[PDB]
Amino acid sequence: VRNECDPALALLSDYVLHNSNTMRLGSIFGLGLAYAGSNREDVLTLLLPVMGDSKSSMEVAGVTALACGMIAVGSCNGDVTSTILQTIMEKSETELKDTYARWLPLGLGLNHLGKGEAIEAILAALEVVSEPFRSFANTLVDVCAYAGSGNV
Amino acid sequence: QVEDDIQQLLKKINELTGIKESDTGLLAADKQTLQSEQPLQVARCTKIINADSEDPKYIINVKQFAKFVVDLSDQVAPTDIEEGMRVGVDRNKYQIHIPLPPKIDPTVTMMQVEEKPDVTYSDVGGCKEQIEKLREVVETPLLHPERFVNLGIEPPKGVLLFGPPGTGKTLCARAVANRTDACFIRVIGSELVQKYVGEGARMVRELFEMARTKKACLIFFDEIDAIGGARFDDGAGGDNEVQRTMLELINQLDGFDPRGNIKVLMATNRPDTLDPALMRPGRLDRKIEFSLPDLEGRTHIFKIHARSMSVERDIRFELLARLCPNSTGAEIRSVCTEAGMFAIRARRKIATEKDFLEAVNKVIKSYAKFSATPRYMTYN
Amino acid sequence: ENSEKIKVNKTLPYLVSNVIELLDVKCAVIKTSTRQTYFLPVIGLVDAEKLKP
Ligand SMILES: Nc1ncnc2c1ncn2[C@@H]1O[C@H](COP(=O)(O)OP(=O)(O)O)[C@@H](O)[C@H]1O
């Protein structure tokens, strides 16, 4: 939901603030699910540099991108379009692992869904790195909305 | 069509798409495992005559061939190979390769229900007493198996259902096998008598064989009258084959060596042609009858039956139930659906009182000559 | 003695055969578990008494 009466979700954004392991971790969790429908660039602007900081065991930004994927879902965010284009392509900080590959990949895959010509840079973090998650998703940015078809 | 237009092109995308990477990538789940298990093996099954001691050398008759006293696999102790055990035999080497389990033929397994007949205790109106005991014979012992020990006793390990044709006995089978859980074996006596002499005996065994390896299973016999009920005898030896089959069922059903968690459900219309050896308790304890609904019952039967259709909410099934003295709950069903025709025969959604009244007078009365519920009451 | 006996006897394949006639003209015929009759002129390992149909 949004908050109806008591806005416990929004105040949480105060508690998120820290570039440390478990704090970010479940705050990333909290704020992912906070900012589905409460979506905010801040948490990005919080996590984006933490994402630029790129430390799963400390910055926790790995899974953050996924929580970030949980923020603007189904919308074109030119920033995240560029932002992870500015991180993943850049391979910010620690990234060697297929981790910061994929934490950022699927980060774009959620947010965009249904924008038409605006969703093109989602693959840029996703189908870039060759995995079983790669050459297929190339057209999955197309079905970025349907809910009733896929058996094909 | 625009939505439909979007539908077609969208589907064509995948169609177009799928062909793409198809070109790109051009067995091992199996061809490995196939070729893996190709260097594997076959082993002709064997039937052990028996082993010997001061050493092993197991003694065996295969099948289409003959007996070979032959060594056994190194991987199987000298115990886990009791007699009468279809084991597998290094084909050429002719030495016990691995052990196995027992035959049951393709007639006993063909009747293990797999699925389950949707017939909850909601459709079983007018039997607060019938199902009440049944649940004791079948439900409670199979599920909550504490009390019967906390106090130490035994439940009607088998139970009998009888009544004219149309009381709901087959629903109770279907009802039970539904909310039961155990293994519900549906075996009809029609199944039991075949052609060549002494053939049914194999069925009961298999039945009791398969009943056994699986603790807590419901054997159900609908139409037991078919298998065997009376023990005639004369200068013709007619219903002899079937009689034994009964004795077989009799014997294994409660005579020397316990049976186990094989609970037993028998369904008849004529509970009068049945051998005392069936009837007696031990074999068939709880004896349950399925009355021809009285007053409050049929109302539940009507309400249950009609509860699931578009009926006129003013009309009270009670009146109809009153005009139904002794008709089974089945006929009452021909009415509820009967109005359907009438209700459809004009053009209407909802039925009226008369729609039922007619049905009552249309089914019951008209289809009275037939009924057979009054000839089957005295079990003829 | 022990040597060859183990090779010939050690052969755990054993085709049981129900004796038939115990001709003493030391001869004796037998029908196999394969339903095959072979007149063995050397009852081999197995005393006469051991012998009977
Ligand atoms: N009290 C009842 N409640 C619900 N349905 C009933 C009742 N009595 C009879 N029926 C219906 O009538 C049919 C009678 O079946 P059953 O008595 O098993 O036939 P048979 O007597 O040939 O074994 C069942 O299919 C059931 O749907």
Instruction: List, in sequence order, every beta strand (DSSP E) within A1-152.
Output: none
Would you call C10 an interface residue with chain B, using a CB distance cutoff of 8 Å?
A: no
Helix (H, G, I), strand (E, B) or coil at B184: strand
The pocket around ligand 1, CB under 6 angstroms, is made up of B 123-127, 165-171, 267, 269, 301, 304, 328-330, 333
Confirm whether residue B88 is marked as ligand binding.
no
- Contacts of B among chains (3+ CB pairs under 8 A): A, C
Regarding chains C and A, contact by 3 or more CB pairs under 8 A is answered as no
Q: Is B371 in contact with B380 (CB distance < 8 Å)?
A: no
To the nearest whole Å, the CA of C32 is away from the closest chain B CA by 8
To the nearest whole Å, the CA of B59 is away from the closest chain C CA by 9
* In chain B, alpha helices (H): 2-25, 28-36, 105-108, 130-137, 139-142, 147, 169-176, 189-192, 200-212, 240-254, 276-279, 296-306, 317-322, 331-345, 353-359
Helix (H, G, I), strand (E, B) or coil at B312: coil
What count of other Cβ atoms lies within 10 Å of the Cβ of residue A31?
29
Q: Is B98 in contact with B73 (CB distance < 8 Å)?
A: yes
Angle CA(B208)–CA(B214)–CA(B217) in degrees, nearest 5?
A: 70
Record the tokens describing residue B90, joined without a space.
């290094």
Resolution, Å (one decimal): 3.5
Helix (H, G, I), strand (E, B) or coil at B2: helix
Which residue from B166, B176, B194 is spatially nearest to B328, judged by alpha carbons?
B166
Where does residue B260 fall: left (phi above 0), alpha (psi -120 to 50 degrees), or beta otherwise?
Answer: left
Element (H, E) at C19: strand C17-19
Torsion of CA B323, B326, B331, B336, to 10 degrees: 30
How many CA atoms within 13 Å lie on the side-chain side of B300?
13
Torsion of CA A100, A103, A105, A108, to 10 degrees: -130
Going by DSSP bridges, is the β-strand pair B262-267/B158-162 parallel, antiparallel, or unpaired? parallel
Of B57, B66, B93, the CB nearest to C33: B66
- Looking at residue B216, the DSSP 8-state letter turns out to be S
Q: Is B160 in contact with B266 (CB distance < 8 Å)?
A: yes
Residues of chain C contacting residue B73, judged by C-beta atoms under 8 Å apart: none
Helix (H, G, I), strand (E, B) or coil at B153: coil
Which residue from B335, B331, B336, B350 is spatially nearest to B307, judged by alpha carbons?
B336
Spatial distance between the Cα atoms of B222 and B159, rounded to a whole number of angstroms: 12
What count of other Cβ atoms lies within 10 Å of the Cβ of residue B316?
15
Angle CA(A116)–CA(A121)–CA(A127) in degrees, nearest 5?
A: 110
Q: Is A111 in contact with A75 (CB distance < 8 Å)?
A: yes
Place of tokens 């060859």: C4
How many CA atoms within 13 Å lie on the side-chain side of A23?
13
Spatial distance between the Cα atoms of A73 and B204, rounded to a whole number of angstroms: 64
- Looking at residue B185, the DSSP 8-state letter turns out to be E
CB contact under 8 A, B13 and A136: no
In chain A, how long is the greatest CA-to-CA distance? 46
CB contact under 8 A, A139 and B17: yes
- Nearest C-alpha to atom 26 of ligand 1 is from which residue? B168
Record the tokens describing residue B93, joined without a space.
């080497």
Spatial distance between the Cα atoms of B213 and B208, rounded to a whole number of angstroms: 9
Spatial distance between the Cα atoms of B207 and B263, rounded to a whole number of angstroms: 12
Mutate to test the pocket of ligand 1, among B224, B292, B333 (most ligand atoms within 8 A of CB): B333
Q: Is A25 in contact with A18 (CB distance < 8 Å)?
A: no
Interacting residues of A1 by C-beta distance below 8 A, sequence separation 6+: A37
Record the tokens describing residue A11, joined without a space.
């105040």
Record the tokens describing residue A118, joined without a space.
């605006």
Experimentally, the structure was elucidated by cryo-EM
Residues of chain B contacting residue A142, judged by C-beta atoms under 8 Å apart: 13
Instruction: List, in sequence order, every beta strand (DSSP E) within chain B.
Output: 44-50, 58-61, 67-70, 87-89, 96-98, 158-162, 183-186, 217-222, 262-267, 286-289
Record the tokens describing residue B318, joined without a space.
């009670």
Which residue from B260, B199, B224, B219 is spatially nearest to B113, judged by alpha carbons?
B219
Spatial distance between the Cα atoms of B41 and B92, rounded to a whole number of angstroms: 11
Which residue from B162, B161, B164, B145 is spatially nearest to B153, judged by alpha carbons?
B145
Spatial distance between the Cα atoms of B206 and B363, rounded to a whole number of angstroms: 44
CB contact under 8 A, A142 and B11: no
Residues of chain C contacting residue B94, judged by C-beta atoms under 8 Å apart: 12-13
- Helix A41-53 and helix A61-69, axial crossing angle in degrees, nearest 10: 150
Spatial distance between the Cα atoms of B113 and B184, rounded to a whole number of angstroms: 7
Strand C28-32: give its sheet, edge to edge.
C17-19, C28-32, C37-40
Element (H, E) at A9: helix A8-15
Spatial distance between the Cα atoms of B320 and B354, rounded to a whole number of angstroms: 10
Residues of chain B contacting residue A140, judged by C-beta atoms under 8 Å apart: none
Spatial distance between the Cα atoms of B68 and B81, rounded to a whole number of angstroms: 16
Q: Is B301 in contact with B266 (CB distance < 8 Å)?
A: no
Q: Is C26 in contact with C43 (CB distance < 8 Å)?
A: yes
Interacting residues of A77 by C-beta distance below 8 A, sequence separation 6+: A41, A111, A112
Determine the atom of ligand 1 nearest the C-alpha atom of B223. Answer: 23
* In B67-138, alpha helices (H): 105-108, 130-137
The phi, psi pair for B159, rounded to 5°, reads -140, 145
- Looking at residue C23, the DSSP 8-state letter turns out to be -
To the nearest whole Å, the CA of C17 is away from the closest chain B CA by 9
Interacting residues of B140 by C-beta distance below 8 A, sequence separation 6+: B147, B148, B155
Where does residue B202 fall: left (phi above 0), alpha (psi -120 to 50 degrees), or beta otherwise?
Answer: alpha
